[PDB]
Design a protein around this ligand. Structure first.
Ligand SMILES: [Mg+2]
Ligand SMILES: [Mg+2]
Ligand SMILES: [Mg+2]
Ligand SMILES: [Mg+2]
Ligand SMILES: [Mg+2]
Ligand SMILES: [Zn+2]
Lengths: 329, 121, 53
RNA sequence: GGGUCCGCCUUGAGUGCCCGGGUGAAGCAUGAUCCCGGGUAAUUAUGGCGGACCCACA
RNA sequence: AUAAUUUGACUCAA
């Protein structure tokens, strides 16, 4: 009943004396509303009807944005958690697209099966499953393995089975339900589906329907009230909550935003259990997202060593002028 | 009660509203369902708008009270959408109904309109 | 739609009354939205009164 | 030479689906059916081209 | 441009 996004890491302190200057940078709280939007992500409750792609098009049009992208395609009839990264935050979806997801599904059986048998057989689907993407898909139709982290049956009303399921990204629930029906012998189809979790995003007070999103927008635009629309948009830092982090010194920030790789002497703090090749989020000591990168060292190697490239910086999100140039020749 | 319910309707008055829908269904003209009802209001054709109190999500009918007030059209609440649907002569629920021609419910709709007016203030 | 959610504890259920806390459940799926939003003015008038704006 | 940042490496027409307008009848008025109109996302990697910054062990 | 990813897309013509 837990996904990889729920597993927490210990913080390893490399430099205890490292502190941050309050005059530099823009932490989420200090961002003016216009800047907040530029580096924002919406935890959208998608309605049934439109495709996820159309919904993003609608958001772009209504909020007058040049750029937006979602964290994984929900089907037209499917509702629920759709992370929509905005403007300068658009590329953060690369941390969201391959992330674990949770669904609540309604399965309709084509025959009568005892409740204990349903529970028993559905338990057998936890673990690795082999799927081929359906004729209607956005990816290559080849056999591939996907992980089902957990299945929890909530309730059964005759042929209708309501269940929660945690899956690896790109797991087709309609196909999963089809094979459960085959394992039960009678056959089954998916009648209803809702996404309840997408990476770090879930059903909390930040989850917002299109109705509330646009209404809060006009409360700002036309009423002059910023508070509601501010809470409608999450800082891009939220889209990075599930990733291992390296916290860097002020004097290393501008260098990274200007294209430098992250060397060992720039690290103040870091999460434990980082392996070579892992995707890490480079953060300031104010918890601003600076960049995404690939670890060239393990957590222990970053902590013990005094020299060398710790993180290969790949995607810079922070503007160059938030922190002053503090590097030397 | 949901936040789109602006005033408390006594049992007797709610039953008269359903009675008026049944009579206007048989002897006059009605529109049933929220889209039909909304169009009737905006076109200025509705004599009375009937709104169910158990509509979920609220957004289906939430626009109707402010719309009716703008168009100067009286509205009334009934406790049950299934019951309102039944009164409208359909097999399913109706979130809202508009009476266009009261027919033999002429005097009943007039009474309802009088009683909602004092509830509004 | 058959999937319902309790407003109190967040339980997903098919029942009208939550099997965990007993609260009256609501449909889990959001209502239809349109970018044309022809009645947005009237929905916002309701919403402002609810929120206290 | 390298890295980061931005842009580009087709455009139409149609199907599907949806949304609006009109119509307003198992499932279904929280919208059947048909007509008209419109809408339909990004990311990653590699390469090429145009541009902006920087070359940084903190 | 080419190859991929994401639970939803497909066909044709320059
Ligand atoms: Mg239509
Ligand atoms: Mg035709
Ligand atoms: Mg058409
Ligand atoms: Mg170049
Ligand atoms: Mg120039
Ligand atoms: Zn509950």
């Amino acid at each position: 009943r837990i996904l990889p996004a729920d597993i927490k890491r210990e913080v390893l302190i490399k430099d205890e004396n490292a502190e941050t200057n309050p005059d530099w940078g823009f932490p989420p709280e200090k961002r003016p509303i216009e800047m907040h939007i530029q580096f924002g992500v919406i935890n959208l409750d998608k309605p049934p009807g439109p495709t996820s792609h159309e919904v993003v098009a609608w958001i772009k049009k209504i909020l007058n944005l040049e750029k937006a992208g979602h964290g994984g395609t929900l089907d037209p009839k499917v509702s629920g958690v759709l992370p929509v990264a905005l403007e300068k935050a658009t590329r953060v979806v690369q941390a969201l697209l391959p992330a674990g997801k949770e669904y609540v599904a309604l399965m309709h059986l084509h025959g009568d099966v005892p409740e204990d048998k349903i529970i028993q057989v559905m338990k057998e689907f936890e673990g690795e499953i082999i799927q081929r993407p359906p004729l209607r898909s956005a990816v290559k139709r080849r056999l591939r393995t996907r992980k089902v982290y957990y299945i929890e049956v909530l309730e059964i009303e005759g042929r209708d089975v309501l269940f929660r399921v945690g899956v690896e990204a790109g797991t087709y629930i309609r196909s999963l339900i089809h094979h459960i029906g085959l394992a039960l012998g009678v056959g089954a189809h998916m009648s209803e589906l809702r996404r309840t979790r997408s990476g770090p995003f879930k059903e909390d007070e930040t989850l917002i329907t299109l109705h509330d999103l646009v209404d809060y927008y006009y409360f700002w635009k036309e009423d002059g009230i910023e508070e509601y629309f501010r809470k409608a948009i999450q800082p891009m830092e939220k889209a990075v909550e599930h990733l291992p982090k390296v916290w860097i010194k002020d004097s290393a920030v501008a260098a990274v935003t200007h294209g430098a790789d992250l060397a060992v002497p720039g690290i103040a703090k870091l999460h434990a259990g980082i392996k070579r090749g892992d995707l890490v989020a480079i953060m300031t000591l104010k918890d601003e997202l600076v960049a995404l990168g690939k670890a060239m060292m393990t957590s222990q190697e970053m902590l013990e060593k005094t020299k060398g490239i710790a993180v290969d910086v790949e995607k810079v999100f922070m503007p160059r002028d938030w922190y002053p140039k503090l590097w030397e020749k | 009660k949901p936040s789109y319910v602006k005033f408390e309707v006594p049992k007797e008055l709610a039953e008269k509203a359903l009675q008026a829908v049944e009579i206007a269904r048989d002897t006059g003209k009605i529109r049933k369902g929220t889209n039909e009802t909304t169009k009737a209001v905006e076109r200025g054709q509705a004599k009375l708008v009937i709104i169910a109190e158990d509509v979920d999500p609220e957004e289906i009918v939430a626009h109707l009270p402010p719309l009716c007030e703008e168009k100067e059209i009286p509205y009334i609440y009934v406790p049950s959408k299934k019951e309102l649907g039944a009164a409208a002569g359909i097999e399913v629920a109706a979130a809202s109904v508009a009476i266009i021609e009261p027919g033999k419910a002429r005097d009943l709709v007039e009474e309802i309109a009088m009683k909602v007016k004092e509830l509004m203030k | 739609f058959r999937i319902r959610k309790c407003p109190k504890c967040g339980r997903y259920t098919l029942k009208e009354v939550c099997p965990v806390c007993g609260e009256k459940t609501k449909v889990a799926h959001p209502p239809r939205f349109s970018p044309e939003d022809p009645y947005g003015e009237y929905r916002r008038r309701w919403k402002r009164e609810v929120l206290g704006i």
